[PDB]
């Protein structure tokens, strides 16, 4: 697995199992599940008031207000319609599924539910991909703190939309392994000339932040420049699916890089021990 998936498997398999049972005519089993997603997201699936014919899926995001300020509620309403209900205390969005009244193609809503998190993010991108297209310049850029110490800035310009990430590297060495990775992103167009352009700065914040930017030997700034062919209505969704997984994509690969090195070290260390024990009579 190279790219990270966008949908939550726990949500999908929990709903899928319940629907399969509702349609089969079996009495409903109770459900209580607490789980998470990347970026400090917390989910909760349960039976409101103990009614087993009802399955609620709730997601909690510390930075939800920021997404709300950018059309989050309106977008979620479009996608989930009647399944959207008042949020469960402690969460920002709640989906409710009546096991006694399910749609013909259940497998369809099961997948939209698995995308709850990605759909909470969708609006911020649709708003600016929309500005850019209507040539509406000068619009204030959005600031989304997807993590306690990381930020995402989105700004629309005449012919492009910029998505900047202020990410952090914990292990001081991880900064180096990261510089290597960003370097290949920097030169990416040598592999795909139509792909978005990626800029990278270390310690110094980009111009697109002209705003409480964080200076630090472990802060990394990755700028993605998205063009109309990436932001228009036809590519928009896939673009959002990629761009929103970027930060976790980078760290995921840094860690998998270290895993691959551990195997190299196991092979070499092992080779040595063979040569050493061969020194015995």
């Amino acid at each position: 697995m190279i790219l990270l998936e966008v949908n939550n498997r726990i949500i999908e398999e929990t709903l899928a199992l319940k629907f399969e049972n509702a349609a089969a005519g079996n009495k409903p089993e109770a459900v209580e599940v607490t789980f998470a997603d990347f970026d400090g997201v917390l989910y909760h699936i349960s039976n409101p008031n103990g009614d087993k014919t009802k399955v609620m899926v709730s997601i909690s995001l510390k930075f939800y207000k920021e997404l709300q300020a950018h059309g989050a509620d309106e977008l979620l309403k479009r996608v989930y319609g009647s399944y959207l209900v008042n949020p469960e205390s402690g969460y920002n969005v709640s989906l409710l599924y009546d096991l006694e009244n399910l749609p013909a193609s259940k497998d369809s809503i099961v997948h939209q539910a698995g995308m709850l998190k990605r759909n909470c993010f969708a609006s911020v991108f649709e708003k600016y991909f929309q500005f850019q297209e209507e040539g509406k310049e000068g619009e204030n850029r959005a600031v989304i703190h997807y993590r306690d110490d990381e930020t995402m800035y989105v700004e629309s310009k005449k012919d492009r939309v910029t998505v900047v990430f202020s990410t952090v590297f914990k292990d001081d060495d991880d900064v180096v392994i990261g510089k290597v990775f960003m370097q290949e992103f920097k030169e990416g167009r040598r592999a795909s000339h139509t792909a978005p352009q990626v800029l990278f700065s270390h310690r110094e914040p980009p111009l697109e932040l002209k705003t409480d930017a964080a200076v630090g030997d472990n802060i990394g700034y990755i700028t993605f420049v998205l063009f109309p062919r990436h932001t228009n209505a036809s590519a928009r969704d896939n673009t959002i699916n990629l761009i929103h997984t970027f930060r976790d994509y980078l760290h995921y690969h840094i860690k998998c890089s270290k895993a691959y090195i551990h195997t190299r070290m196991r092979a070499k260390t092992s080779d040595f021990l063979k040569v050493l024990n061969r020194a015995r009579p």
Binding site: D173, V180, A191, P196, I261, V275, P281
Partner: protein, 167 residues
């Protein structure tokens, strides 16, 4: 290189002169037996420490004693990525010092990796083969460190391409 063969040659001759050990019961503590180069409690049992340098970065420290020899190696680290790869690798091996019975758990200050070869090792193993192992080890860690570097870079490119080409 033009300077590797001569370096290793000097290191090898030095290790052969230093790996001349015998079993030595403690002279300071009733019925103990300790690697003299580590405890250093009998000045007369310690040999003169000697160094072999290739340049001002790459070198080896060889400390003899009547029953043991400590060997420290300053590994070649050309850049940053190389510095962290070397540190991770030396650490990886040291965590496994027990299986690598001639390795030291921590390096002498100033070096990247240290060996502690004792009379027990030279009793159970051909000392000329232990000499070979040290030289072999020195050459192989540079190659490994290079492969790791290429490995990281190569995987980094494919990773950037995979993500970018999906837009």
């Amino acid at each position: 290189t033009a300077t590797l063969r001569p370096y290793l040659s000097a290191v090898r001759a030095t290790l052969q002169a230093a790996l001349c050990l015998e079993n030595f019961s403690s002279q300071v503590v009733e019925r103990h037996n300790k690697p003299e180069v580590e405890v250093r409690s009998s000045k007369e049992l310690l040999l003169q420490p000697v160094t072999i340098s290739r340049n001002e970065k790459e070198k080896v420290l060889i400390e003899g004693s009547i029953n043991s020899v400590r060997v420290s190696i300053a590994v070649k680290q050309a850049d940053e990525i190389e510095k962290i790869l070397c540190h991770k690798f030396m650490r990886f091996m040291m965590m496994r010092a027990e299986n690598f019975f001639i390795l030291r758990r921590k390096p002498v200050e100033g070096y990247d990796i240290s060996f502690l070869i004792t009379n027990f090792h030279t009793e159970q193993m051909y000392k000329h083969k232990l000499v070979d192992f040290v030289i072999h080890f020195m050459e192989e860690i540079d190659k490994e460190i290079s492969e790791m570097k290429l490995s990281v870079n190569a995987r980094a490119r494919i990773v950037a391409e995979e993500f970018l080409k999906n837009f």
